[PDB]
Amino acid sequence: DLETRSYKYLLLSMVKLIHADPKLLLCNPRKQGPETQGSTAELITGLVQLVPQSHMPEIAQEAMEALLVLHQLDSIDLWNPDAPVETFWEISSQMLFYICKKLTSHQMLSSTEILKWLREILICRNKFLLKNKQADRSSGTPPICRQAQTKLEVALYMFLWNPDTEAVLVAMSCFRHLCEEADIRCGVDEVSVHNLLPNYNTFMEFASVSNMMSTGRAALQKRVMALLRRIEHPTAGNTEAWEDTHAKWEQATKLILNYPTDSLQEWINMTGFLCALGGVCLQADTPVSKFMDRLLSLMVCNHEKVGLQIRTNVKDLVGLELSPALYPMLFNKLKNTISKFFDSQGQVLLTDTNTQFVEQTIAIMKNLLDNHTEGSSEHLGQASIETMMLNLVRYVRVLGNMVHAIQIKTKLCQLVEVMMARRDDLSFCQEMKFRNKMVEYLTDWVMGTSNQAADDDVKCLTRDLDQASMEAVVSLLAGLPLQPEEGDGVELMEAKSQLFLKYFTLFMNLLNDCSEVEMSRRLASLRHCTVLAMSNLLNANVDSGLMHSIGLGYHKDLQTRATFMEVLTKILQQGTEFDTLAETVLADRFERLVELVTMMGDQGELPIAMALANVVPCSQWDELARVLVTLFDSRHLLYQLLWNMFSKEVELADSMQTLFRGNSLASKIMTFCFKVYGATYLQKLLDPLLRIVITSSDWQHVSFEVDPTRLEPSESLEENQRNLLQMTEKFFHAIISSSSEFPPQLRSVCHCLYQATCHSLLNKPQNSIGAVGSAMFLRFINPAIVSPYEAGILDKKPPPRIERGLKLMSKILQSIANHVLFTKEEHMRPFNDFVKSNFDAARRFFLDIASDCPTSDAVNHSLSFISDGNVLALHRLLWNNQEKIGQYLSSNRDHKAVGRRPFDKMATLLAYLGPPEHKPVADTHWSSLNLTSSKFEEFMTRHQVHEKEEFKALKTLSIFYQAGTSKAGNPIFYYVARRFKTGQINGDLLIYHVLLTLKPYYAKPYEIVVDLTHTGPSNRFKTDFLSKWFVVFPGFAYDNVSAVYIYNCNSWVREYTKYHERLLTGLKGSKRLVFIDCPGKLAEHIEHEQQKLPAATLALEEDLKVFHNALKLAHKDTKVSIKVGSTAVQVTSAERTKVLGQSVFLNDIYYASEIEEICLVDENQFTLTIANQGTPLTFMHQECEAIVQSIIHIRTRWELSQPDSIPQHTKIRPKDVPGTLLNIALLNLGSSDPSLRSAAYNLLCALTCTFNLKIEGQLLETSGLCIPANNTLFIVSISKTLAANEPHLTLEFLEECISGFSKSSIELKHLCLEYMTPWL
Amino acid sequence: SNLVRFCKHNDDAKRQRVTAILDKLITMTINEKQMYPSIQAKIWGSLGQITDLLDVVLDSFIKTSATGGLGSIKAEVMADTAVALASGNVKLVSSKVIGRMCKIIDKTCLSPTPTLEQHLMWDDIAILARYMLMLSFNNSLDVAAHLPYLFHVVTFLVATGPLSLRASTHGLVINIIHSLCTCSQLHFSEETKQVLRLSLTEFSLPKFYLLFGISKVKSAAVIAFRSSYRDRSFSPGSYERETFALTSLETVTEALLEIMEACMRDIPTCKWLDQWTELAQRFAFQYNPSLQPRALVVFGCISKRVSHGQIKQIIRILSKALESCLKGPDTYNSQVLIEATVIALTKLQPLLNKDSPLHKALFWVAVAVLQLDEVNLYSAGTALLEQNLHTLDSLRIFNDKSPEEVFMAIRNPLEWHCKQMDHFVGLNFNSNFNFALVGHLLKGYRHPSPAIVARTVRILHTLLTLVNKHRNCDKFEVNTQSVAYLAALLTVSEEVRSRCSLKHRSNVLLDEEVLTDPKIQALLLTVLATLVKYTTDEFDQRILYEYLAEASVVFPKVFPVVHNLLDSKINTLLSLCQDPNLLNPIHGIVQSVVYHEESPPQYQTSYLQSFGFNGLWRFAGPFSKQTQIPDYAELIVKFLDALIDTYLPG
Ligand SMILES: CCCCCCCCCCCCCCCCCC(=O)O[C@@H](COC(=O)CCCCCCCCCCCCCCC)COP(=O)(O)OCCN
Ligand SMILES: [Zn+2]
DSSP states (O other), X not given: XXXXXXXXXXXXXXXXXXXXXXXXXXXXXXXXXXXXXXXXXXXXXXXXXXXXXXXXXXXXXXXXXXXXXXXXXXXXXXXXXXXXXXXXXHHHHXXXXXXXXXXXXXXXXXXXXXXXXXXHHHHHHXXXXXHHXXXXXXXXXXXXXXXXXXXXXXXXXXXXTOSOHHHHHHHHHTXXXXXXXXXXXXXXXXXXXXXXXXXXXXXXXXXXXXXXXXXXXXXXXXXXXHHHTTOXXXXXXXXXXXXXXXXXXXXXXXXXXXXXXXXXXXXXXXXXXXXXXXXXXXXXXXXXHHHHHHHHHHHTOOOTTTHHHHHHHHHHHHHHTOOTTSHHXXXXXXXXXXXXXXXXXXXXXOOSSHHHHHHHHHHHHHHHXXXXXXXXXXXXXXXXXHHHHHHHHHHHHTXXXXXXXXXXXXXXXXXXXXXXXXXXXXXXXXXXXXXXXXXXXXXXXOOXXXXXXXXXXXXXXXXXXXXXXXXXXXXXXXXXXXXXXXXXXXXXXXXXXXXXXXXXXXXXXXXXXXXXXXXXXXXXHHHHHHHHHHHHHHHHOSTTTHHHHGGGGGOSOHHHHHHHHHHHXXXXXXXXXXXXXXXXXIHHHTHHHXXXXXXXXXXXXOHHHXXXXXXXXXXXXXXXXXXXXXXHHHTTOHHHHHHHXXXXXXXXXXXXXXXXXXXXXXXXXXXXXXXXXXXXHHHHHHHHHHHHHHHOTTTOSOOOOOOTTTOOTTSOHHHHHHHHHHHHHHHHHHHHHTTTTSOHHHHHHHHHHHHHHHHHHHXXXXXXXXXXXXXXXXXXXXXXXXXXXXXXXXXXXXXXXXXXXXXXXXXXXXXHXXXXXXXXXXXXXXXXXXXXXXXXXXXXXXXXXXXXXXXXXXXXXXXXXXXXXXXXXXXXXXXXXXXXXXXXXXXXXXXXXXXXXXXXXXXXHHHHHOSOOOOOOOOSOOOOSXXXXXXXXXXXXXXXXXXXXXXXXXXXXXXXXXXXXXXXXXXXXXXXXXXXOSSSSOHHHHXXXXXXXXXXXXXXXXXXXXEXXXXXXXXXXXXXXXHHHHHHSOSHHHHTEEEEEEEXXXXXXXXXXXXXXXXXXXXXXXXXXXXXXXXXXXXXXXXXXXXXXXXXXXXHTTOSOEEEEEEEESSSOEEEEEEEOSSEEEEEESSOEEETTEXXXXXXXXXXXXXXXXXXXXXXXXXXXXXXXXXXXEEEOSOHHHHHHHHHHHHXXXXXXXXXXXXXXXXXXXXXXXXXXXHHHHHHTTOSOHHHHHHHHHHHHHHHTTTTOOOSSOOOOOSOOOOOSOOSSSTTTHHHHHHHHOGGXXXXXXXXXXXXXXXXXXXXXXXXXXXXXXXX | OOTTTGGGSTTSSSHHHHHHHHHHHHHHHHHOOTTHHHHIIIIIHXXXXXXXXXHHHHHHHHHHHHHHOTXXXXXXXXXXXXXXXXXXXXXXXXXXXXXXXXXXXXXXXXXXXXXXXXXXXXXXXXXXXXXXXXXXXXXXXXXXXXXXXXXXXXXXXXXXXXXXXXXXXXXHHHHHHHHHHTOSSSOOOHHHHHHXXXXXXXXXXXXXXXXXXXXXXXXXXXXXXXXXXXXXXXOOXXXXXXXXXXXXXXXXXXXXXXXHHHHHHHSTTOOHHHHHHHHHHHHHTSOOTTTHHHHHHHHHHHOOOOOHHHHHHHHHHHHHXXXXXXXXXXXXXXXXXXXXXXXXXXXXXXXXXXXXXXHHHHHHHHHHHHTTOOHHHXXXXXXXXXXXXXXXXXXXXXXXXXXXXXXXXXXXXXXXXXXHHHHHHXXXXXXXXXXXXXXXXXXXXXXXXXXXXXXXXXXXXXXXXXXXXXXXXXXXXXXXXXXXXXXXXXXXXXXXXXXXXXXXXXXXXXXXXXXXXHHHHHHHHHHHHHHHHHOOOHHHHHHHHHHHHHHXXXXXXXXXXXXXXXXXXXXXXXXXXXXXXXXXXXXXXXXXXXXXXXSOOSSOGGGSGGGTTTSHHHHTSOOOSSOOOOSOTHHHHHHHHHHXXXXXXX
8 A cells, every 4th residue: 555655755756856957867878779778768758658647646747847957958968978969859859759649649637738848848949959050050850850740730730629728829829939940940931931831921820819818719719710711731730630630520429419518619619620721631532521411411400409509500610610612512512412302303392301401501601602701702613503592492482481481581582682792703604594583583472462461460571571572683683684585486576575574563563552652661661672673674674675664754653753764864875886985985984083093192102002902801802903903004104003012011021022922912913913914925935945845856755854763774864964954955045035025014023123122122242133033033934834734835734754854944943043052952963063154144134124224214105005994893993992991091191181182082083973883794604813724624624515505506506617628728717707696605615615626726727717797796705705715725826827817897897896906906917817808819819619608698699780889978988889689788898998907898788687777868869777777878879769679679578578577666765765755854844842853954964965956055964953943934945945946856745745744733734735835 | 014114103102003913913823823834934924024124023022021931831932933033034133132132141230149040130031042042043143243242142151040041052052053064155165164063073972061061961952942832831940050160161162262263264354253352351340240250261261462451450350359258258159259360360371471570470379379278269279370380481481590589589579468478377488488389289189179189299390390400400309409399299209209219128318418407307207297197098108107217217306396296196006007018117116206215305396386387287288168268368468469569550
């Protein structure tokens, strides 16, 4: 009994003796025997095994102090005087390896106490490393040092989720000592600090948060899980801490569930931790995939004991905490689980579990989409959320009616509203076909006056359900053209009008019930929404729904009438066609906007840009970067922006280079600059060299390897070394020579950095060029060389043996910039000789670019392009953040009144322009700056475009088909402009089809002929979709364009080119562009009997009578030759026109069926108005009736050909009814509601300018005018003057005036008499 | 259509008949609501085209409206009827409704009243205002000839009256600008028309809705007009009426002036600006407690020339306002005639002769106002001081002399009056100028408005850059002259804190090599104590206590004159403070006191009263809630009178 107790007392005393003096027991070392361990090692192992005992807490406490005295600098030498810097690391490292594995193994009572001692040991061993490195670097890193460095990290992560607050706070602090050791081992930051410890930058943040006030575990976990979400680079420590704690989590779950609060709180912490850091372990059956399924099988956890709390928390975490790198996997699993609810034949099955699982799937999606977090945007694009949403409504659709199921419907309606605020972030395969269906399904649930029939006030919630539904429908309809499902063939035009009438009546019926005479806030809000819904419906599609809406002019609600005219006013100001109407009206209207943004703040302050930077949320930093760079370049002030933006970042953080490579608003500016302009420069330069190494037989097969371990005996080392050096010279010489070809933009970019560092040096033999040269080369030139295939330079991935040479080439080249010889790199030391000569040469290349004038007074390019597309986004951005940007301006600028300073100017102008218009829909898939030919090909290949059955349709349409060969023998392709509709099909599938056909042959030179016969605005490419063609293709194929032939061009095409000139400037004066002025030329250059132009085009054949020397009377007269074809009329101009610097003759073609109007005003000249062409076409011929006779003959023949011409019309546009609108304006300009009159005056202003009406006074459109009530003589002088000057409107005006007489009241009836008489 | 002859029938009592006929027609319009659109076109539309008959017809409208009242149905309808009448002769009805407005206002002098709403003729103005509102649209008020007279009346109505009449004045302005853009008599170039359209937008921003006093109103038009104006009379309520601030009228009066100048560039030999000036100048120098304050803030904002004779009147209208305040119990009435005098002077100084003595004598008027302890006067007082220094620089008066030399030189002739003022206020300017001009500027930190706190900081910066430049000492050197301005900027300016750092963490404040005078180092400690007695902020107390702990050791002998100021607050901090950062400096103070306390005190607490500065700590206190004249202003009245006599003999 006491004998055992005696030993403990003796053992405790001995340990304290070592604490007092460690040299007493360290004298006369035994030294490590070849077959036995030494004496100092055996002593340490004895003390270590007492720390985690917990059977003898007093001894364990002392053992910590004893081992902490043997680590002081004084006592380190005594371990082994023979070699003090080799035995230490071996002994000390194994101590960490033993102890760390114990903490991870399981929880211990003193777990929070061993950690405080373990921190000190790290501090001590850092000190001994510092001095040893100082004295002699020679410091060794045996496998144990690596095998124990890992396990140290694996034991600092799994402590982050420990429940005790003190443990986690200490653990975060211990990351400093893990980083500070990195600097000692390698002074140079980039080489090792970001290579030995890849996630070095994030670790530094742990320290800052730890130095913060203590708070409950819930508050702390939020910051901890945030930091764990930014671990970008996988590492052995990360990839093993996730799995080690995954096993504990899985088994812990079984105990909680199987058993029929502290236990739960531990479970919650492990889950939150285990998700935020999931992204590292990413990359079929896998540990990560098994985590999700087990997670989803808990959202429906029905457990009487603790079921409620589990579901309440899994919803909270998966929503607000998941790592943005796991969204693409969450959706896929989520969609499949839903898909198995609809059995074959599409009948929903209600099991009361799926009901619970959909009610959760709605809450998870809402939180996930609602939160804007860093990096989320890049990942949302990959997945397609369409198919899941549609299936989701169907299940809720059949759920039935009850107090419970109504609440589910409510939230589902709220989700769709949040899902339409991120529509730009998400990706849609078919937006139109999807957004229409949701409108179809949702309108069903809107039922008014159903709570009175139900006779239960408990179901007042139905008022909320109707209130919620409209809010969703309003967001959906913003910019949505209607499209009917092609269940039957009833003609497209007639189907849409029928569809429009279906919705308009629905809203109108709902509108009458909301009348107050027939809760006031409820009706006030609901009525307000139901009117905004109609406004969005009309704007998108006026042609098919303007007639159905005219009845709103005389509505019974004066408020409703007021709104209708406001929306009606906007339509007139917009242009029915392109009309160069934004080129004039929008260009001038938004001209001032850039001047405000480009406000040259004194001494380069630029308050608008600088202020806009900080205030804008980080999510849109992508959009903000592109807009600023593009805009300032147009103004020739790019240098100014860079100096201001970089200076704050560089001066703020002396580590200038490091931050720029890091993620931030300033950083992203560089990325855009290099990528947008660099791409062309790199590919043009590197490409010729790549052919030589990859394909030339002279190079044949050789290994660019000098690794003795991998060195193959077959090849001589000398041969490889000399060849690799010779190849490097080829690349190096090319880079230095091509100094001129450097784009101006980067030249300016380098200068600003040069001035920044040079100014940075002044305040602080470092060479500014040295840092610049290494920086530019490392981030711009180096990446392309290593992997040209990914950059898109090379179609096919280089063979691995060729790949190795490029990799080694980069290292040699990079060393030249730093003027660093090969240290501990004997592998490449023989090459060190070569770099010596080229050190001076590299300097010259850097200086030339860095020698550009700080102010480019001499270097000038006054391009001053309009940049129409960019401006719209800029105005859109300002409107959203109008308030918040003001607050930033408000804080400063007190020295001078802001009346002449940004905030005053911003508010005035921004209000003046009014709200921005809604964005149009997107035909193409979601795409971002990070796009290249390799990326596009992989994405489409992974998609199953082959069997879509819409890809197949392109084959039938015969668009871009290969046709035989040419005189030179090159294959020919024919692209048909007619066959492509603007939006009816996704625009990416067209590119994939074209790319697929050209892939086999585009390597060799090829000739392409494009047929633009009968081109119209219907078949067109938008600005955004057009840009992809320049980038999607690999790029080397562009050079293989042997020749281009254009046939049957028309004026409309020329007009398009003028508007999109900037993008097509590259093709300006293009040698490859050859224009077929007449049919008799193409057959000569092309192989006759091989050309396969469209049969329909040839069917016209231009084989009818020619009325030579007909003159097109217009603003300018151009001789036009008219051919009256059998089925159409072709107008061929006889005067050459300049298109892209090449002369050509335009040949407009008018199909006979399209000839609605044929008026022969006189034998000298005839009138030919055509559908939606505005002013008719007038020409002069000596015998007009001879021509018109045939045209009437042609049209009359078609009338017989067509099945039913009598059914037509029932379609109108604002230009068609000048009279009708004039009536409602005048009638409502005397109403009794003050607001209504103000709207009427504005409508009159926007109606007297579009149609160039002549009135006596001048009218200006504004808001807020206070008009007098007695407007009984003003509208009796406007009416009189118009009738005198514009009599032709009599028939239109008089008919409508009568129709409003009946609807108006007694008091207004007398007014109609007053201004009606002058017209008779 | 035949009453032309009868209206001037030799006053044979037949003229009395036509007015009965006209009065009968007016009653038909009020009752026959359904036939309204047809009566206006026939009866009034045609009857208003007889020039000779306009004068009598228009007169009858005013009488009918008068009886009903401001919101009565009868008066409301005649306003609409006037629109049709004016279509025939815009040039005659417009120039006759305006002529009555300008004459009613000019008769308010006979029986002055504290406010317009309390004047007897208030109703006559109110109804006449609605006529101008309706006639504003579509240029039925001839702007091309009456623009001067319309702005003149706009300024006297902004933000006065019931919420209906306040929304009307906003509508009136929005229509006058609109008529300018769409008038054919004037030929505005395409450059000018851009200016007008931007101004048209500004007045509809929520910034100006506050200035006119109709904030919390979504739209002005809706309130201005009432739909059921024929059936029932207006029903005003919520008699609570916001206040009006003479600084707001500056923004309005300067926004309008911008529009007028733009037009004057095109119209050759225009007379608008000279007609507007005369109207303002007539009310400026005439006693009317209801219009004089508003007519002075407008005279200064627009005038282009000022003479000695005019300046004497402005400074002697300030003399009488002070006298009235103390004599009678009506204070707020006459506390706005002073705040308006200072704002006027703030605008007219840079137009002076450039060599008059008054360019320098307006530095003691600014000082004499800060001594009255009122938030509104104090805010207006600094605005004069800030610009007075700015003006003198452009005239290069500080080239070879120091502020003390300049301002103290023009104070010698009337020193006898000044000396007594310094005795009571508890500050002296002869003993130490650079510290007396800083007690007055230490109260600014206690102002509620965060926009005046910035102004005082800027004022200190400019004074600092002027004393050093006289010595050519880098603008931040520490000397006897430039030490008061560094203690004041210590807690707000980073450059002063960094460039002058505490030794016991360039040069360090509290240097004993240069600060070797007991008097110049006794003041420097009360300034630091003063800033902490009233300040309440962790960052401010931290920095100021660290500089006091070091003061205990560097200046052991003079430190005990700062006990009573620190006595009360320190005692509480020791008991309850729980801040390691803020508790360290306090302990260092306690230890130093006991160590130094071993000999008779060289200087008692009353050492400052010996040479004048006994009231420095009181003058930096918070603004009194019980707003009252300090009652020693009886000397400021005598001081000002001597100033006029000495430099403006006549
Ligand atoms: C890059 C092409 C841009 C224009 C594309 C227009 C859209 C139709 C193109 C034809 C459809 C079939 C696929 C064609 C793929 C190959 C295009 C090609 O050869 O591109 C090169 C040559 O381009 C051409 O020859 C295109 C000539 C097209 C016809 C002339 C333009 C006006 C008429 C067509 C307008 C668009 C269609 C009708 C709607 C307005 C570009 O040379 P680069 O040096 O600029 O390369 C980029 C390096 N950074
Ligand atoms: Zn797709």
